[PDB]
């Protein structure tokens, strides 16, 4: 029955081959070992297309399901680590770190998140959440001599292992309210009473579900992890470690708690009406680009919950598609921050000022991924937000879309401010790259994976809204397996 | 001067009470990662008084 | 013959909560770290009282013998004789944590008592090393194979974050603009 | 209910062997009249490889006891657990972790 | 000793771990105070397995995996403190507030 975890066991083989080549060959292997992880992750995507037409089996004695939604969220998490290896092939190879030991942790957090999206038992959720979270503490402090990644490794551990203890306390009561029954469909037939034990079991699990996605009372690690961590890790913790948290929020709250359902549509409303506020107004007074993109992803996590709390077939399909186009924006925004940080140091805003005549592939690249996050037409993040507010307006929720619109205008102001300080600043107002840009080459080690990692996202940013009718049918067909 | 100062004073006040709202919650984060562990734990206590009534 | 299972419960339940206050409130950290074995042994005493002979014998091995030895090495490595005792650092935010911890405790006790549990009067543990091993290879198989992937990653990561950089500490590898060895290239700068 | 058999003598023997030092050190109590360790991270590194391998041993003890009542498919599955954690062992030798 | 008295033991063992998670000033005492939380979710878990679903223990299997995660989270967890101590030569959680705003 183990043909359904075949996308992950191509990554577990690939986890060992890119590790064993590090011990055998030893940093002469980094010339070829990043391209084997690409054909392992791409080989993991390529074998779900035989599995997409399969009739959604429940394998491994009820501990793992292979439904249509579990095939979808296993696609984005492998694709985000596909986009990260395209960035990190020069970045961490420029730090002086061994490149084989970085990918062995990153392709373990990838297999962690692929096993959350299809998990069905209370123990397999927790272990798969742990191996994504344990590998995420090691990546954020991986540079190990920075005095910023050291203090960002520890801020993520004393909250992550804390919230993995709150999450276990809600998993344990959920085993205790039912008479045993650690599987998630076996739970929901056993508890229906909506007592006080079920509510404490509900808030304690969405203190760990809504920590990966950084809802705003639990958002505190994200702006302090994201400016300390190495930047390709940040590119995975904003797309991969959020699609993994948004996949758990649908596999848990629609399976374990369908009896209590007016409450986790009300708690996630207060996480939605408050992460759109504090994600967007606090990103105004941020100087660093890696800290501006930190408060964006808190606020961009607030737009996804608008499709979550409404509870319709167009509701969940609107939050699946918005993550599908959010992968084409943060991996094209963080590609350009990396590409700017490798050429010159201190990649912060008010040092981008004076571009557009020195590296105009970056400036055209970074603009269409920052403008689309603010939702201007015709890019992907305009068509992504329209289907949110078409989903919010369909069934109640007249005030959730309106808060998602007055704060979609404040989001315009801090994305434009980078686009202002790239294309409108005259050649008498540039601070760095005052003839200090390195006279661009795209010929060194790993720069050509970065150039193909940016062009295939900017093309996938601008054209994903015009060509959205394939993706709207791929996503609406993944929702009929959600109760 | 009622154009440049009254009806231009309101529009230049929407852009002022949102910039000083940003510099008020910029001070919500202060380092000291134990204080971040309070707000995770206080909101757990908040939502279980919120949602039982 | 049954009251000696009640007296040995409350003598173990008071062995943990006086040691759990010891690992938190005590003024010295080595006296705090050694009492953590008092928590882990006394908790292992409760697992035998709850008919969990394998989970107790697996806890003295891991928590007392491996984790607590890992804690004690990681405290003899950092003493440095510089405590600096700045106790009134900024504010009295150690009383605000005493309200949330007392708040969660009074919250959980109201949940525990009033919730009707469906306790069964059947005899447990038919040799619970045989029915715990027929779970590892039928139902809990994929968490058992992922525990191997988690532990291998936890050895790759914990070695590269704690080992000594005696290979090449002064290594200027390359450059477009300057980057220090084993550091992220975004150099710190204040606007 | 307490359906463990054989633990009646374990509580008595826990007290009596605990009365071996506390009474003998009291039986002797009535008859008798530039400080640096160097921070060398090998005491941690030898103990980390213990924790990863004290947990591997725990996971194989339900397998070893209930082996000859499970079969071959539970031996292929239990070989993946050993063969992966061998790669953890080759990683510790090669990266000079347990060198001392 | 019934089922109820194990849970109030586990619910009290949790909240001493919370009080150490927020108040402790040594960087290592927060790691020991995390381990108290990962025992209170074990003392809750076996106690849910003895009185509920006694014939097939699904809790004592789930009690095994919590020990192996927390042993792997404290092996990772002390590697981080030992990377900080080589850069910042103290372990003081009121000294790691340099990523302020």
Coordinates of C-alpha atoms in Angstrom, one line a residue, chain A residues 122-123 126-127 130 134 137-138 144-148 150-155 157-158 161-162 164-166 168-169 171-173 175-183 204 223-224 227-228 286 291 295, chain E residues 7 10-11 14 18 21 27 30-31 34 37-38 40-41 44-45 48-49 52-53 56-60 62 65-66 69 72-73 76-77 79-81 83-84 86-88 93 96-101:
Chain A
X122 CA -2.3 12.5 16.0
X123 CA 1.2 11.1 16.3
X126 CA 3.4 15.7 15.7
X127 CA 6.5 13.9 14.4
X130 CA 8.7 18.2 14.7
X134 CA 13.7 20.8 14.3
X137 CA 16.0 25.8 14.0
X138 CA 19.2 24.4 12.6
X144 CA 27.0 30.1 13.3
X145 CA 29.3 33.1 13.3
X146 CA 27.1 36.1 12.8
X147 CA 25.9 37.4 16.2
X148 CA 22.5 37.8 14.5
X150 CA 22.9 33.1 16.8
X151 CA 20.2 35.3 18.5
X152 CA 17.7 34.3 15.8
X153 CA 18.3 30.6 16.3
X154 CA 17.4 30.9 19.9
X155 CA 14.3 33.1 19.5
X157 CA 13.7 27.5 19.6
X158 CA 12.3 29.0 22.9
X161 CA 9.7 24.1 21.2
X162 CA 7.3 26.0 23.5
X164 CA 5.3 22.3 20.1
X165 CA 4.6 21.7 23.8
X166 CA 1.3 23.6 23.7
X168 CA 1.1 18.3 22.2
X169 CA -1.0 19.3 25.2
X171 CA -3.1 16.5 21.0
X172 CA -3.0 14.6 24.3
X173 CA -6.4 15.8 25.5
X175 CA -6.7 11.4 22.7
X176 CA -8.3 11.6 26.1
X177 CA -11.7 13.1 25.2
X178 CA -12.3 10.3 22.7
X179 CA -11.9 6.8 24.1
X180 CA -8.4 6.3 22.6
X181 CA -8.6 6.7 18.8
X182 CA -5.5 8.6 17.7
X183 CA -6.7 8.7 14.1
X204 CA -4.2 24.4 22.4
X223 CA 10.5 39.5 12.2
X224 CA 13.3 38.4 14.4
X227 CA 16.5 39.2 9.6
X228 CA 18.9 36.8 11.4
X286 CA 11.0 49.0 8.5
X291 CA 12.5 42.7 7.8
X295 CA 5.9 41.8 8.2
Chain E
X7 CA -4.0 14.9 35.1
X10 CA 0.3 16.8 34.7
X11 CA -1.5 20.1 34.6
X14 CA 3.1 21.9 32.9
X18 CA 5.7 27.6 31.8
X21 CA 10.1 29.2 30.3
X27 CA 19.9 30.3 28.6
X30 CA 15.0 27.6 29.7
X31 CA 15.9 24.3 28.1
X34 CA 11.0 23.2 28.2
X37 CA 6.4 20.7 29.4
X38 CA 7.5 17.7 27.4
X40 CA 3.6 16.9 31.4
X41 CA 2.4 15.9 27.9
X44 CA -1.1 13.1 30.6
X45 CA -0.5 10.6 27.8
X48 CA -4.9 8.5 29.3
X49 CA -3.7 5.1 28.1
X52 CA -8.8 4.6 28.6
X53 CA -8.0 2.0 25.8
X56 CA -4.3 -1.7 23.0
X57 CA -2.1 1.1 24.3
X58 CA -2.1 3.8 21.7
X59 CA -0.8 6.3 24.4
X60 CA 2.3 4.4 25.5
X62 CA 2.7 7.9 21.5
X65 CA 7.8 9.3 20.4
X66 CA 7.6 12.3 22.7
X69 CA 11.6 14.2 19.9
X72 CA 16.4 15.3 19.7
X73 CA 15.2 18.8 20.5
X76 CA 19.7 20.5 18.8
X77 CA 18.8 22.9 21.6
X79 CA 24.0 23.0 20.1
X80 CA 22.5 26.5 19.6
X81 CA 23.6 27.8 23.1
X83 CA 27.2 28.4 19.2
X84 CA 26.2 31.5 21.0
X86 CA 31.6 31.0 21.5
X87 CA 30.5 34.3 20.0
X88 CA 28.8 36.1 22.9
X93 CA 18.5 35.9 27.9
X96 CA 20.1 38.6 23.3
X97 CA 17.7 41.6 22.6
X98 CA 19.7 43.1 19.8
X99 CA 17.1 42.3 17.1
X100 CA 14.7 44.7 18.7
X101 CA 12.3 46.3 16.3

